[PDB]
Amino acid sequence: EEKEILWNEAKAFIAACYQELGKAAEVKDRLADIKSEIDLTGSYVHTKEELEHGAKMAWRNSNRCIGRLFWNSLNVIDRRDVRTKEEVRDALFHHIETATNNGKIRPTITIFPPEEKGEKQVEIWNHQLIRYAGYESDGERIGDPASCSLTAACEELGWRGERTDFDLLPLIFRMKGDEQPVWYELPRSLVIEVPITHPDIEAFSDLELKWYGVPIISDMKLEVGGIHYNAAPFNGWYMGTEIGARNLADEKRYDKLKKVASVIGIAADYNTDLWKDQALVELNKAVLHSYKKQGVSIVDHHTAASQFKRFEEQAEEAGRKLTGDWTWLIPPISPAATHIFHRSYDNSIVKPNYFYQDKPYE
Amino acid sequence: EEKEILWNEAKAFIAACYQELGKAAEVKDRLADIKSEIDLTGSYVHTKEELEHGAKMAWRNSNRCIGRLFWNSLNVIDRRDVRTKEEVRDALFHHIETATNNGKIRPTITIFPPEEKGEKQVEIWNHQLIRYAGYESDGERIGDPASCSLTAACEELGWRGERTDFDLLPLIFRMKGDEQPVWYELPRSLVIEVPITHPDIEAFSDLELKWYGVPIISDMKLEVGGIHYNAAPFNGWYMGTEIGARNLADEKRYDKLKKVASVIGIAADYNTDLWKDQALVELNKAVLHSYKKQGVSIVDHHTAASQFKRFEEQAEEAGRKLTGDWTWLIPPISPAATHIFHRSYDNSIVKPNYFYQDKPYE
Numbered sequence: 001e002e003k004e005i006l007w008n009e010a011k012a013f014i015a016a017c018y019q020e021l022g023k024a025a026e027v028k029d030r031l032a033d034i035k036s037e038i039d040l041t042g043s044y045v046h047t048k049e050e051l052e053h054g055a056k057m058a059w060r061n062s063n064r065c066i067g068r069l070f071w072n073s074l075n076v077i078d079r080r081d082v083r084t085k086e087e088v089r090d091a092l093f094h095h096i097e098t099a100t101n102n103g104k105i106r107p108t109i110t111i112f113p114p115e116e117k118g119e120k121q122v123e124i125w126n127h128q129l130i131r132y133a134g135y136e137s138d139g140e141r142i143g144d145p146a147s148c149s150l151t152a153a154c155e156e157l158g159w160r161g162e163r164t165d166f167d168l169l170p171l172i173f174r175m176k177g178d179e180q181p182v183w184y185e186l187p188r189s190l191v192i193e194v195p196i197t198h199p200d201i202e203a204f205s206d207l208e209l210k211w212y213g214v215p216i217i218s219d220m221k222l223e224v225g226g227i228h229y230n231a232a233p234f235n236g237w238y239m240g241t242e243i244g245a246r247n248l249a250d251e252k253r254y255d256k257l258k259k260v261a262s263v264i265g266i267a268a269d270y271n272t273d274l275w276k277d278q279a280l281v282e283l284n285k286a287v288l289h290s291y292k293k294q295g296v297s298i299v300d301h302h303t304a305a306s307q308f309k310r311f312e313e314q315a316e317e318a319g320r321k322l323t324g325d326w327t328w329l330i331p332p333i334s335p336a337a338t339h340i341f342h343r344s345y346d347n348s349i350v351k352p353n354y355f356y357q358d359k360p361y362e
Numbered sequence: 363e364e365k366e367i368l369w370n371e372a373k374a375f376i377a378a379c380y381q382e383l384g385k386a387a388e389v390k391d392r393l394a395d396i397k398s399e400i401d402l403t404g405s406y407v408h409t410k411e412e413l414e415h416g417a418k419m420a421w422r423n424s425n426r427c428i429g430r431l432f433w434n435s436l437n438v439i440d441r442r443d444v445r446t447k448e449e450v451r452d453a454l455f456h457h458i459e460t461a462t463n464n465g466k467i468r469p470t471i472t473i474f475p476p477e478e479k480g481e482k483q484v485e486i487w488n489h490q491l492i493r494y495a496g497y498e499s500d501g502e503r504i505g506d507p508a509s510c511s512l513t514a515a516c517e518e519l520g521w522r523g524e525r526t527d528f529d530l531l532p533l534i535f536r537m538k539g540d541e542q543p544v545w546y547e548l549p550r551s552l553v554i555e556v557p558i559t560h561p562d563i564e565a566f567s568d569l570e571l572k573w574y575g576v577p578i579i580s581d582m583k584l585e586v587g588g589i590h591y592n593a594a595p596f597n598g599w600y601m602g603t604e605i606g607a608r609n610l611a612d613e614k615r616y617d618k619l620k621k622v623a624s625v626i627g628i629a630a631d632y633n634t635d636l637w638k639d640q641a642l643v644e645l646n647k648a649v650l651h652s653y654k655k656q657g658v659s660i661v662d663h664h665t666a667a668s669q670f671k672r673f674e675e676q677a678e679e680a681g682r683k684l685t686g687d688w689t690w691l692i693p694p695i696s697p698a699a700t701h702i703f704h705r706s707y708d709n710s711i712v713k714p715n716y717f718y719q720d721k722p723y724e
């Protein structure tokens with residue numbers, strides 16, 4: 001039953017992948033080899049080209065990603081050879097280091113062994129390799145509320161945070177065979193952080209805001225040709241809105257708009273003053289300014305939308321059918337100022353692709 | 363064939379309408395009367411209660427409307443008795459006058475005779491009873507580009523605009539039997555306009571911006587129980603974003619962001635400065651300020667979203683299933699600051715409702 005699914009997804013992937021690579025003739029043989037490998041081993045193994053390209057195709061088919069223009073420049077690290085929790089840990093450390101690149105962020109994915117019989121070889125508990133801890137107890141909210149579950153789950157296993165608003169969560173993952181996951185404290189020399197300051201408002205530094213430079217997603221499954229790489233952390237650079245309009249602005253997150261309104265010298269009393277809208281912009285101006293001033297890669301939503309437009313154009317020219325999720329593609333600040341707002345997108349799911357998978361804890 | 367459709371939509375509407383009104387017992391008889399009326403006349407006629415309520419239900423089911431909270435306070439004018447183009451003209455004049463109410467805008471709908479055999483008795487060419495003319499010739503763009511087709515169609519019939527950026531388009535509609543539509547110049551004493559000024563920036567008045575106070579939609583069909591009221595102009599007040607983030611901001615409209623950026627003293631050179639986002643807010647602050655300062659009703663998107671939330675709550679409490687269009691419900695400025703952004707809506711179409719119908723010209 002399962003070997004039928006795997007076989008059909010393999011035929012589809014190889015025939016398409018080799019067509020884009022220009023190896024349409026090599027399809028016939030590679031198919032037969034796969035047919036035997038699935039017949040005997042129950043699962044086939046990707047070549048380095050198939051894996052590297054399949055990961056690039058997956059990014060290209062991420063309907064909710066606005067930065068898909070550079071899908072073909074994805075730096076792919078093949079760590080399907082790891083067996084010990086030290087190799088995995090070091091691989092995670094390396095990914096952070098190489099992807100950060102002193103600030104010149106490289107879109108990188110590290111690929112660990114896939115699910116064998118649906119059985120995870122590696123199980124990463126982090127949603128992002130670099131994230132801030134969250135604490136909620138006695139009506140006291142500290143840090144990132146979105147990380148409350150993982151933080152508590154980490155603290156159930158002997159980890160303890162300093163209870164600042166920006167405690168670096170440890171790398172926590174579980175091996176196949178192990179009943180409990182292990183956790184490792186993040187070497188702070190590997191983590192670039194950016195303090196948020198305003199280009200013309202010196203009082204903005206009184207807010208003492210900051211964020212990590214590199215978003216490394218580690219809660220999604222890379223699916224390539226029937227093979228399920230559940231542990232494949234990937235990263236790009238930030239679109240400024242993600243930090244200033246969601247992470248630091250949301251009431252369910254850092255909730256900083258009232259404090260931002262105070263330091264910029266506007267009242268936060270009346271809706272018709274649009275103080276939230278005004279605070280949102282200045283905060284986002286501060287974020288972009290701070291990242292550029294530090295030398296950490298970042299993109300504004302207007303530039304990102306322009307890049308995504310070229311991606312649309314590039315897609316049509318290559319004969320590729322375009323897919324996208326309008327609700328996620330539009331930026332949370334001035335969405336009507338982008339071309340994305342004024343056109344529709346097909347939200348059909350095309351494989352290879354990245355799929356969200358629920359965490360073992362909460 | 364048709365009389366089957368009309369009969370089923372009549373059963374559904376009357377049984378539901380009379381249930382909400384508390385006249386569930388009167389359903390049985392009224393149904394039978396309708397059954398005979400459709401049998402003989404080919405179409406039935408609504409009572410004043412059924413029409414008034416059906417129009418309120420239609421507003422309540424407008425998935426793309428954020429201001430549905432006050433659906434039950436809709437002022438319904440029943441002008442199904444008009445026969446001459448003077449009665450229709452005066453009815454249109456009256457609607458404008460009563461709905462404006464010196465600035466205290468009343469949500470009002472004027473209902474003209476429905477399509478008889480699918481044949482329109484009245485055919486309104488305006489998209490809004492009050493709108494600005496648009497001119498495009500010799501690379502010269504004047505007025506509202508969205509109104510270019512109608513403006514040219516009006517000028518084909520002897521009308522001529524002064525070619526300012528805010529020429530009031532004439533009321534233009536066609537009668538059943540007439541081959542051509544008639545046009546009437548709008549009595550300017552009936553039209554409230556609001557000059558746009560900034561609360562703290564005196565240089566904003568140098569832009570010489572303004573907009574009409576009342577949006578009166580006249581391009582949609584009111585469908586109530588199988589009956590098609592193609593000509594039923596309705597109005598509410600403005601949500602500030604509609605004027606400042608779409609009408610005056612869009613490149614395909616008035617395209618004022620660069621000029622707004624200049625008068626507020628910011629550079630319009632770099633994307634990372636977020637000058638578009640910053641200009642958008644200040645322009646929208648100016649719009650809300652100008653309407654409140656003049657005494658013309660208006661709502662900000664934050665207040666509107668709060669009102670729409672009560673509508674959601676009211677819906678659940680009444681046992682009513684909620685329907686909405688997320689893509690239209692979110693405001694084009696700071697959408698993530700509203701609850702609407704963080705929840706989903708069923709975009710199912712429930713009747714009675716308002717349906718868009720293409721204009722006879724372009």
Ligand code: HEM
Binds near residue numbers: 299
């Ligand atoms: C080059 C820098 C990149 C930028 C600026 C970017 C931008 C974004 C943004 C803004 C989102 C939506 C976040 C939200 O508002 O919720 C997103 C989603 C996503 N991006 Fe990208 N992205 C980048 C690189 C990548 C890379 C390298 C991959 C993987 C190969 C990727 C795959 C995805 C996926 C899978 C999602 C959806 C995640 C989910 O389910 O929520 N992106 N991207």
Ligand code: HEM
Binds near residue numbers: 424469471596604666
């Ligand atoms: C009370 C004041 C009202 C406000 C503030 C309001 C607000 C809005 C807004 C913002 C939109 C979307 C416009 C856009 O962004 O494209 C909308 C759409 C709509 N509203 Fe309302 N509305 C109001 C009253 C009414 C009334 C009185 C009716 C009719 C009974 C109505 C029916 C609709 C319909 C049918 C649409 C969709 C029109 C289309 O197809 O584009 N609304 N409303």
Ligand SMILES: Cc1cc(N)nc(CCc2cncc(CCc3cc(C)nc(N)c3)c2)c1
Binds near residue numbers: 234238239
């Ligand atoms: C590679 C990459 C780059 C970038 N700039 N942003 C992202 C998205 C980051 C991101 C941040 N916060 C939240 C999410 C979504 C979380 C999420 C949660 C659930 C339940 N289902 C989903 N499909 C997704 C994504 C990814």
Ligand SMILES: Cc1cc(N)nc(CCc2cncc(CCc3cc(C)nc(N)c3)c2)c1
Binds near residue numbers: 577599600601718
């Ligand atoms: C009663 C009412 C109040 C209000 N504040 N806004 C509206 C919507 C006004 C409005 C302005 N510009 C454009 C539109 C949509 C035009 C439109 C165009 C097409 C092709 N299909 C549609 N369904 C709709 C609506 C209606």
Ligand SMILES: C[C@H](O)[C@H](O)[C@H]1CNc2nc(N)[nH]c(=O)c2N1
Binds near residue numbers: 341342345
């Ligand atoms: C494709 C997209 O859903 C469509 O163009 C919607 C987007 N949201 C919108 N929002 C508003 N206010 N008005 C519109 O016409 C639209 N159009």
Ligand SMILES: C[C@H](O)[C@H](O)[C@H]1CNc2nc(N)[nH]c(=O)c2N1
Binds near residue numbers: 328688704705707
């Ligand atoms: C219901 C709604 O479509 C859903 O919550 C979407 C809206 N758009 C979004 N946009 C972003 N950036 N992130 C999200 O998680 C969502 N969620």
Ligand SMILES: [Cl-]
Binds near residue numbers: 215242247
């Ligand atoms: Cl993030």
Ligand SMILES: [Cl-]
Binds near residue numbers: 604
């Ligand atoms: Cl309008």
